[PDB]
Design an enzyme around this catalytic site. Structure first.
Site, PDB file in Angstrom:
ATOM      1  N   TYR A 188       5.603   0.583  21.155  1.00 44.54           N
ATOM      2  CA  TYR A 188       5.339   1.956  20.786  1.00 44.54           C
ATOM      3  C   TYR A 188       6.346   2.469  19.739  1.00 44.54           C
ATOM      4  O   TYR A 188       6.103   3.531  19.147  1.00 44.54           O
ATOM      5  CB  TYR A 188       5.291   2.886  21.995  1.00 44.54           C
ATOM      6  CG  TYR A 188       4.263   2.491  23.067  1.00 44.54           C
ATOM      7  CD1 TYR A 188       3.223   1.580  22.806  1.00 44.54           C
ATOM      8  CD2 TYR A 188       4.317   3.060  24.329  1.00 44.54           C
ATOM      9  CE1 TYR A 188       2.316   1.248  23.766  1.00 44.54           C
ATOM     10  CE2 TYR A 188       3.412   2.727  25.296  1.00 44.54           C
ATOM     11  CZ  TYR A 188       2.399   1.806  25.005  1.00 44.54           C
ATOM     12  OH  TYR A 188       1.512   1.447  26.006  1.00 44.54           O
ATOM     13  N   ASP A 213       5.649   6.178  31.311  1.00 44.30           N
ATOM     14  CA  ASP A 213       5.177   4.879  30.828  1.00 44.30           C
ATOM     15  C   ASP A 213       5.591   4.704  29.374  1.00 44.30           C
ATOM     16  O   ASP A 213       5.209   5.520  28.512  1.00 44.30           O
ATOM     17  CB  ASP A 213       3.665   4.772  30.945  1.00 44.30           C
ATOM     18  CG  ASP A 213       3.166   3.389  30.598  1.00 44.30           C
ATOM     19  OD1 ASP A 213       3.281   2.493  31.476  1.00 44.30           O
ATOM     20  OD2 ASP A 213       2.706   3.199  29.464  1.00 44.30           O
ATOM     21  N   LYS A 254       7.371  -2.531  28.792  1.00 45.41           N
ATOM     22  CA  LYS A 254       6.454  -3.653  28.632  1.00 45.41           C
ATOM     23  C   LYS A 254       6.992  -4.698  27.644  1.00 45.41           C
ATOM     24  O   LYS A 254       7.518  -4.378  26.575  1.00 45.41           O
ATOM     25  CB  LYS A 254       5.075  -3.160  28.201  1.00 45.41           C
ATOM     26  CG  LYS A 254       4.539  -1.965  29.014  1.00 45.41           C
ATOM     27  CD  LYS A 254       3.102  -1.666  28.657  1.00 45.41           C
ATOM     28  CE  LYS A 254       2.583  -0.371  29.215  1.00 45.41           C
ATOM     29  NZ  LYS A 254       3.104   0.802  28.466  1.00 45.41           N
TER      30      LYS A 254
HETATM   31  N1  LIG Z   1      -2.347  -1.807  26.667  1.00 45.66           N
HETATM   32  C1  LIG Z   1      -1.764  -0.941  27.507  1.00 45.66           C
HETATM   33  O1  LIG Z   1      -1.007  -1.247  28.590  1.00 45.66           O
HETATM   34  C2  LIG Z   1      -2.022   0.490  27.155  1.00 45.66           C
HETATM   35  C3  LIG Z   1      -3.028   0.767  26.231  1.00 45.66           C
HETATM   36  C4  LIG Z   1      -3.275   2.114  25.939  1.00 45.66           C
HETATM   37  C5  LIG Z   1      -2.471   3.088  26.553  1.00 45.66           C
HETATM   38  N2  LIG Z   1      -1.461   2.766  27.411  1.00 45.66           N
HETATM   39  C6  LIG Z   1      -0.617   3.781  28.059  1.00 45.66           C
HETATM   40  O2  LIG Z   1      -1.494   4.777  28.616  1.00 45.66           O
HETATM   41  C7  LIG Z   1      -1.103   6.053  28.122  1.00 45.66           C
HETATM   42  C8  LIG Z   1      -2.321   6.960  28.202  1.00 45.66           C
HETATM   43  O3  LIG Z   1      -3.341   6.485  27.375  1.00 45.66           O
HETATM   44  P1  LIG Z   1      -3.657   7.057  25.875  1.00 45.66           P
HETATM   45  O4  LIG Z   1      -2.373   7.627  25.232  1.00 45.66           O
HETATM   46  O5  LIG Z   1      -4.357   5.882  25.198  1.00 45.66           O
HETATM   47  O6  LIG Z   1      -4.832   8.141  26.046  1.00 45.66           O
HETATM   48  P2  LIG Z   1      -5.029   9.480  27.000  1.00 45.66           P
HETATM   49  O7  LIG Z   1      -3.794   9.850  27.727  1.00 45.66           O
HETATM   50  O8  LIG Z   1      -6.365   9.266  27.702  1.00 45.66           O
HETATM   51  O9  LIG Z   1      -5.350  10.548  25.839  1.00 45.66           O
HETATM   52  C9  LIG Z   1      -4.366  10.887  24.857  1.00 45.66           C
HETATM   53  C10 LIG Z   1      -4.991  11.825  23.840  1.00 45.66           C
HETATM   54  O10 LIG Z   1      -5.445  12.997  24.542  1.00 45.66           O
HETATM   55  C11 LIG Z   1      -4.940  14.175  23.874  1.00 45.66           C
HETATM   56  N3  LIG Z   1      -4.721  15.148  24.956  1.00 45.66           N
HETATM   57  C12 LIG Z   1      -4.054  14.903  26.092  1.00 45.66           C
HETATM   58  N4  LIG Z   1      -4.085  16.010  26.868  1.00 45.66           N
HETATM   59  C13 LIG Z   1      -4.782  16.963  26.191  1.00 45.66           C
HETATM   60  C14 LIG Z   1      -5.127  18.289  26.494  1.00 45.66           C
HETATM   61  N5  LIG Z   1      -4.741  18.825  27.675  1.00 45.66           N
HETATM   62  N6  LIG Z   1      -5.853  19.021  25.604  1.00 45.66           N
HETATM   63  C15 LIG Z   1      -6.227  18.452  24.436  1.00 45.66           C
HETATM   64  N7  LIG Z   1      -5.915  17.169  24.096  1.00 45.66           N
HETATM   65  C16 LIG Z   1      -5.195  16.406  24.984  1.00 45.66           C
HETATM   66  C17 LIG Z   1      -3.676  13.740  23.136  1.00 45.66           C
HETATM   67  O11 LIG Z   1      -3.326  14.586  22.008  1.00 45.66           O
HETATM   68  P3  LIG Z   1      -1.804  15.062  21.728  1.00 45.66           P
HETATM   69  O12 LIG Z   1      -0.859  13.979  22.129  1.00 45.66           O
HETATM   70  O13 LIG Z   1      -1.849  15.311  20.217  1.00 45.66           O
HETATM   71  O14 LIG Z   1      -1.691  16.318  22.545  1.00 45.66           O
HETATM   72  C18 LIG Z   1      -4.083  12.337  22.723  1.00 45.66           C
HETATM   73  O15 LIG Z   1      -4.860  12.382  21.516  1.00 45.66           O
HETATM   74  C19 LIG Z   1      -0.563   5.714  26.754  1.00 45.66           C
HETATM   75  O16 LIG Z   1       0.176   6.762  26.110  1.00 45.66           O
HETATM   76  C20 LIG Z   1       0.302   4.505  27.089  1.00 45.66           C
HETATM   77  O17 LIG Z   1       1.590   4.956  27.660  1.00 45.66           O
HETATM   78  C21 LIG Z   1      -1.267   1.500  27.741  1.00 45.66           C
END
Ligand SMILES: NC(=O)c1ccc[n+]([C@@H]2O[C@H](COP(=O)([O-])OP(=O)(O)OC[C@H]3O[C@@H](n4cnc5c(N)ncnc54)[C@H](OP(=O)(O)O)[C@@H]3O)[C@@H](O)[C@H]2O)c1
Ligand SMILES: NC(=O)c1ccc[n+]([C@@H]2O[C@H](COP(=O)([O-])OP(=O)(O)OC[C@H]3O[C@@H](n4cnc5c(N)ncnc54)[C@H](OP(=O)(O)O)[C@@H]3O)[C@@H](O)[C@H]2O)c1
Lengths: 307, 307
Positions: free
Chosen positions: B41, B36, B72
């Site tokens: 980004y 994704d 996106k």
């Molecule tokens: N508006 C939209 O369409 C929208 C909005 C938000 C997100 N997104 C997409 O959704 C994806 C996922 O959401 P997200 O990035 O918001 O949050 P997420 O995947 O729920 O959490 C990411 C966070 O979790 C940490 N993390 C992940 N695995 C870990 C582990 N095994 N142990 C310890 N820490 C861990 C990461 O740290 P590190 O990276 O430092 O390891 C980061 O701080 C995004 O990257 C993006 O591609 C889309």
């Protein structure tokens, strides 16, 4: 109207796109008038948004011509036909019509492969190099000044004999040499060589940088912390004050980096710190006990440029 | 090959350019087949170097057609004529000839000013919006499918009524709605609405994200902690296992992000975690005691989209 980079500049290496726009905005509004950029930092478009916002707004009190903007030709663009193309791409990203200064980033010609790897490496982790004489690259840089794309050109990470050789065939002399200088690597002979030969100097990683988790060597320094404490300031400001007192010429500048607005603002007050002769002696002693070149391609590219 | 995105995907929001190449390479080599991405980004070019390298030769073991790539359309490109232009730019950056999926990032049309501010705001700190009907933008998205630039189009951050209206004007149906879903925001009614209407769902911030300094809510949860401990795993794998058991359909996917190679590899083993019915009840009760929508434009743009 500026002949050399303003003494107190502002660095952008390792600042991600999401932080660097706010960082450069903050630097400009604080009063920095020298911004150090590079293509390879992968954040020039975000920086350009800061420049556009500020320079296009008649209310900010800051126009394009009040600021010295530097960028750098990346190692994989040393083939002459690639130099103007990168200059124009960098300027487009930075939202500028001219650069004040464009540097040869390293005296190393990297291959430019079909995926565009910034750091092409063989199976041993050694940088993959291309057959490009430094003089061919330089001639291409000269053509940028002739066209009016850039006001000045210079070099970075050039050693004394490279500089000597360049001076012997340059039609446009390098304005500066941008090199690693800080209390753990004062680089005296090279600085003196540049200045004696009419080449300016820009001190990169002037507070010791962020290097191998990455560490900030300045935070462990009892000498800088003692002087800072006694003067009601930060070790960062004491380090920056040391540079500008040691090399008291408008031809020498420092480019401290922070992506943290409070630190950007605090570092700007380094010019108010007054160091004594005893302060300068103590700082000058640091490298006798701990001497470290951090930005050493022997380490990260397996090419021992500085040996 | 793929009707819907592979269930276990990999996110790239907030990954700086300097980290994201390695991150995407680690994910692909580990086994993730859904990446994704987004224009906003500010890292698609770095991601492209990973894709370019891996898809260049069969010797990697991973073909372009094995991987689902989403990007996106950013809010400032809602004007119909800007849609294809961004699609092509995104694809150039990513070094691909087609996208599997292209989403409308938000149902918010931002102005695209002369300095290209990603987040244009007025004096009051509210996003500056442009007069562009959602159906106009959607028609422009449909053209991308007709041309073959993208296989599928979809939406992100669309609410139930926006989705109903879209189903009524769409000539090409949105494949998915990408929305915030996690134990603190299970979003049940919206998920069910999508699936009941033949729209897939992609869970962003599936582990509760990194949000307002930035914090990971998952590390303070005693429920995920106790279950993780009992099952010899991380709270992260438990949260991911919860998603895929709760909504057990090929139409539902998760896109956990990490830029840390060890965590990228560890999260991929969430499929080996076997949750019980009482584990599910315990996790399902978390939002009754702590419900939080993190990605709320009411906060950061002063536009109350979810109210
Ligand atoms: N508006 C939209 O369409 C929208 C909005 C938000 C997100 N997104 C997409 O959704 C994806 C996922 O959401 P997200 O990035 O918001 O949050 P997420 O995947 O729920 O959490 C990411 C966070 O979790 C940490 N993390 C992940 N695995 C870990 C582990 N095994 N142990 C310890 N820490 C861990 C990461 O740290 P590190 O990276 O430092 O390891 C980061 O701080 C995004 O990257 C993006 O591609 C889309
Ligand atoms: N080859 C080259 O020509 C080359 C090589 C290296 C650097 N450079 C240029 O030189 C610039 C400066 O060098 P640099 O970035 O290596 O190192 P530097 O400016 O000596 O140090 C930067 C580090 O110091 C921290 N910092 C700054 N002010 C601080 C304060 N007041 N309190 C606490 N921490 C503080 C920064 O953290 P935060 O940012 O997190 O606040 C960052 O970790 C670079 O950004 C780049 O523009 C050029």
């Amino acid at each position: 109207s500026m002949q050399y980079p303003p003494r107190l500049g502002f660095g952008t290496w390792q600042a991600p796109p999401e932080a660097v726009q706010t960082a450069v905005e903050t630097a400009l509004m604080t009063g920095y008038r020298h911004i150090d950029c590079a293509y390879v930092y992968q954040n020039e478009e975000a920086i350009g948004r800061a420049f556009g916002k500020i320079f296009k707004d008649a209310s900010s009190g800051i126009k394009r011509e009040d600021v010295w903007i530097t960028s750098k030709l990346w190692n994989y663009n040393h083939r002459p036909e690639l130099v103007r193309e990168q200059c124009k791409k960098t300027m487009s990203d930075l939202q500028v019509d001219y650069l004040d200064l464009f540097l040869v980033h390293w005296p190393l010609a990297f291959v430019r492969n079909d995926v565009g790897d910034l750091f092409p490496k063989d199976a041993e982790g050694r940088a993959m190099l291309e057959k490009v004489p430094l003089a061919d690259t330089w001639r291409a840089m000269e053509q940028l000044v002739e066209e009016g794309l850039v006001k000045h050109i210079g070099v970075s990470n050039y050693t004394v004999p490279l500089l000597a050789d360049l001076l012997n065939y340059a039609k446009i002399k390098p304005l500066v040499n941008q090199i690693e200088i800080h209390p753990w690597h004062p680089n005296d002979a090279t600085v003196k060589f540049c200045l004696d030969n009419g080449i300016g100097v820009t001190a990169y990683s002037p507070m010791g940088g962020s290097y191998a988790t990455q560490k900030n060597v300045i935070l462990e320094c009892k000498t800088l912390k003692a002087i800072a404490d006694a003067k009601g300031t930060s070790p960062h400001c004491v380090a920056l004050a040391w540079h500008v007192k040691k090399w008291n010429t408008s031809m020498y500048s420092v480019i401290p980096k922070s992506q943290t607005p409070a630190r950007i603002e605090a570092n700007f007050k380094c010019t108010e710190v007054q160091l004594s002769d005893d302060d300068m002696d103590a700082i000058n002693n640091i490298h006798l006990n701990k001497r470290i070149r951090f930005c050493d391609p022997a380490i990260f590219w397996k090419v021992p440029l500085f040996d």
